[PDB]
């Protein structure tokens, strides 16, 4: 479903990626003309989405992307600390 609160999203998203990292994908859609942003995480079974017009969130996202990258590159992601 959709999330209003970035934290509640980011936490539930990471839970998903871990549950099965190969099936999950992470999408980001940026729309300069309308000035909005959308982020999606899913494994085709469950979908999780967050949409914003909040420039503060840009930075919040850099961290999310940047951690996911780190988790992808690790052998077992349940051994990487958060």
């Amino acid at each position: 479903p959709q999330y209003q609160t970035w934290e509640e999203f980011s936490r539930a998203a990471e839970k998903l990626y871990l549950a099965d990292p190969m099936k999950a994908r992470v999408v980001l859609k940026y729309r300069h003309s309308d000035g909005n942003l959308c982020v999606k995480v899913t494994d085709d079974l469950v979908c999780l989405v967050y949409k914003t017009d909040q420039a503060q969130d840009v930075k919040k996202i850099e961290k999310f992307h940047s951690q996911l990258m780190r988790l992808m590159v690790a052998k077992e992601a349940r051994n990487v600390t958060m």
């Binding site: 859609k29 003309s33 996202i61």
Partner: protein, 90 residues
Amino acid sequence: MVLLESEQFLTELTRLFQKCRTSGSVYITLKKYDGRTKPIPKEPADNKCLLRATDGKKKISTVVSSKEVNKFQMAYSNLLRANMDGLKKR
């Protein structure tokens, strides 16, 4: 589809953002990666992740291993900061 090493990717991604400014969506998608160059019948490295980006017309992508994450993390984060301007500011 243009597979690039991180440098040109960041150069090319930069471009995309800037051309979808008055009109257009920029999609960036990210996903753990096998190594697969072929299908799966009826090999795999576990230290790779894949980045795809497009505006609907041109597509770019790149592959990022542990060797090169730590550098790429920052460069990319900065690209995002520098191009996803244009929202509200409280």
